[PDB]
Write a protein that binds this ligand. Structure first.
Ligand SMILES: [Cu+2]
Length: 128
């Protein structure tokens, strides 16, 4: 029942962690993103986006082209397993998704799609 993680993106373009692990029993997993720090959504917005590792470049490249107004995510992108909204300083957003959308045999990556960020802002998610 610890079926969450709190994760932070800061003004230094880093997530607080590079690895999330999801337990054995969770019907659902929740990611509670916050942005400590001072920069607004246009300078240093962060979202938390989850996909297969192979799907990550697509989601990031298409997201950029989709623009700020769309939280830098292609709308109705079936590659996205979970997303939060894009957030800036002092904001928060949480996403819950079904653990079953985690296809056994896959490797998963989380990342921010704000332009440039995913060079630093990425990590792995493993089903445990
Ligand atoms: Cu970011």
């Amino acid at each position: 029942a610890e079926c969450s993680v709190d994760i932070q993106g800061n003004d230094q373009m880093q997530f607080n962690t590079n690895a999330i692990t999801v337990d054995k029993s969770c019907k659902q997993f929740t990611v509670n993103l916050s942005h400590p720090g001072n920069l607004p959504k246009n300078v240093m917005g962060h979202n938390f986006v989850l996909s297969t590792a192979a799907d990550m470049q697509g989601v990031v490249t298409d997201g950029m082209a989709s623009g700020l107004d769309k939280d830098f995510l292609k709308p109705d992108d079936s590659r996205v397993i979970a997303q939060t909204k894009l957030i800036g300083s002092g904001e928060k957003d949480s996403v819950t998704f079904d653990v079953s959308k985690l296809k056994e045999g896959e490797q998963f990556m989380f990342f921010c799609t704000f332009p440039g960020h995913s060079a630093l802002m990425y990590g792995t998610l493993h089903l445990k």
